Scaffold this active site. Sequence first.
Site, PDB file in Angstrom:
ATOM      1  N   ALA A 114       6.905   2.750   6.103  1.00  0.00           N
ATOM      2  CA  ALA A 114       7.946   2.872   5.102  1.00  0.00           C
ATOM      3  C   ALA A 114       7.354   2.742   3.691  1.00  0.00           C
ATOM      4  O   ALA A 114       7.922   3.246   2.753  1.00  0.00           O
ATOM      5  CB  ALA A 114       9.052   1.830   5.357  1.00  0.00           C
ATOM      6  N   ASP A 168      -2.799  -6.305   4.629  1.00  0.00           N
ATOM      7  CA  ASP A 168      -1.471  -6.668   4.159  1.00  0.00           C
ATOM      8  C   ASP A 168      -0.323  -6.026   4.991  1.00  0.00           C
ATOM      9  O   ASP A 168       0.587  -6.761   5.413  1.00  0.00           O
ATOM     10  CB  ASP A 168      -1.341  -6.433   2.648  1.00  0.00           C
ATOM     11  CG  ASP A 168      -1.430  -4.989   2.254  1.00  0.00           C
ATOM     12  OD1 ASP A 168      -1.862  -4.056   3.017  1.00  0.00           O
ATOM     13  OD2 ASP A 168      -1.064  -4.695   1.111  1.00  0.00           O
ATOM     14  N   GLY A 217      -1.781   7.864   9.677  1.00  0.00           N
ATOM     15  CA  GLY A 217      -0.425   7.455   9.979  1.00  0.00           C
ATOM     16  C   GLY A 217       0.379   7.153   8.755  1.00  0.00           C
ATOM     17  O   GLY A 217       0.018   7.475   7.612  1.00  0.00           O
ATOM     18  N   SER A 218       1.521   6.532   8.996  1.00  0.00           N
ATOM     19  CA  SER A 218       2.429   6.253   7.914  1.00  0.00           C
ATOM     20  C   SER A 218       3.340   5.082   8.224  1.00  0.00           C
ATOM     21  O   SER A 218       3.305   4.527   9.320  1.00  0.00           O
ATOM     22  CB  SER A 218       3.236   7.504   7.588  1.00  0.00           C
ATOM     23  OG  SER A 218       4.150   7.753   8.609  1.00  0.00           O
ATOM     24  N   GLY A 269       4.137   3.693   2.663  1.00  0.00           N
ATOM     25  CA  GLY A 269       3.184   4.719   2.277  1.00  0.00           C
ATOM     26  C   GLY A 269       2.617   5.467   3.454  1.00  0.00           C
ATOM     27  O   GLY A 269       3.051   5.311   4.591  1.00  0.00           O
TER      28      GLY A 269
END
Length: 341
Positions: free
Chosen positions: A30, A161, A27-28, A32
Amino acid sequence: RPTFYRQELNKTIWEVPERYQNLSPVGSGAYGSVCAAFDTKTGHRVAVKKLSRPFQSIIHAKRTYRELRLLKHMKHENVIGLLDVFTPARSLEEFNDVYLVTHLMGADLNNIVKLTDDHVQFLIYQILRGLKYIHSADIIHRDLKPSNLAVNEDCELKILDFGLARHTDDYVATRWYRAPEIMLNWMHYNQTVDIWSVGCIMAELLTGRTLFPGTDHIDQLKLILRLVGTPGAELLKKISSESARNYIQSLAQMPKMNFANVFIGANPLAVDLLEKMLVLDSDKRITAAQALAHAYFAQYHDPDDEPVADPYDQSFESRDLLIDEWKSLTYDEVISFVPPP
Ligand SMILES: CCn1c(Nc2ccccc2Cl)nc2cnc(Nc3c(F)cccc3F)nc21
């Protein structure tokens, strides 16, 4: 030095050491994008994140440096840390990409909707044990929500994070899990903002429903107050913002509900713990270390295996530096990285 190959995965060129094989998009976001891979050195599967445009601005550059700093520091079973970090750059001058490698966990806690009380005990215990560690380094997560909690089929849990905005194959609002004292400003709060979020998560594991699904930050406060009740004088006097003090008070009467009611059926020790985590007043909410000593976790609590972190230097957070300064500092952290055994 390693030989790198290139591969295109949804319009992003990935450049990784030959060590990492069988790249598979996860997935992705904003900040990375992430692939699963097979690490041939260890014979285990890992996640690889390619930071998106790390030095495009002083804000990207500072974020990039923060993430590397933070992740190099985390060494705990219930916190995501670094197996590896790499760049195809052979010098500072060609440095424009950063890749980070961690354990592949294979799902986030939100997906665990796709639990017995023992399951809740173990999951929440692990969140708190990771938070004891984080909080001990004077780090506050500030956006703990189920999509930031990585979980195996084993039920082992690691705090991330940042989670994924979009998965590949294949929604979770921050405000649902955010503490009331940080709902409008950041003027009076401490590490216990994370404890509120834990309570929200624990509530949802017990019940199968989002606790406080507000449509916006004002509606969020309204759902919260309905459960914990309107605050009295002792809390209202600690609120500086006239606007915040006014919404908290401007409600068609809000009774502190009986958590006993709201969560009927649950282990009464769970309800007790929830009542201590979901305390309106930031200064009186239970800490991670206190919550771990709660009798709810008597099956799991061992004070001799709930470690604290080394000292963490957060001074950079106050600094306003130039893109190339952040970039050189980041590169330093990349070059000095030493992998775990
Ligand atoms: C946010 C994605 N993410 C990272 N990010 C990261 C952070 C810091 C440093 C390096 C990375 Cl890659 N590490 C992960 C490990 N395990 C998985 N599992 C997993 C999955 F396979 C599918 C859906 C959800 C998931 F959590 N996701 C990871």
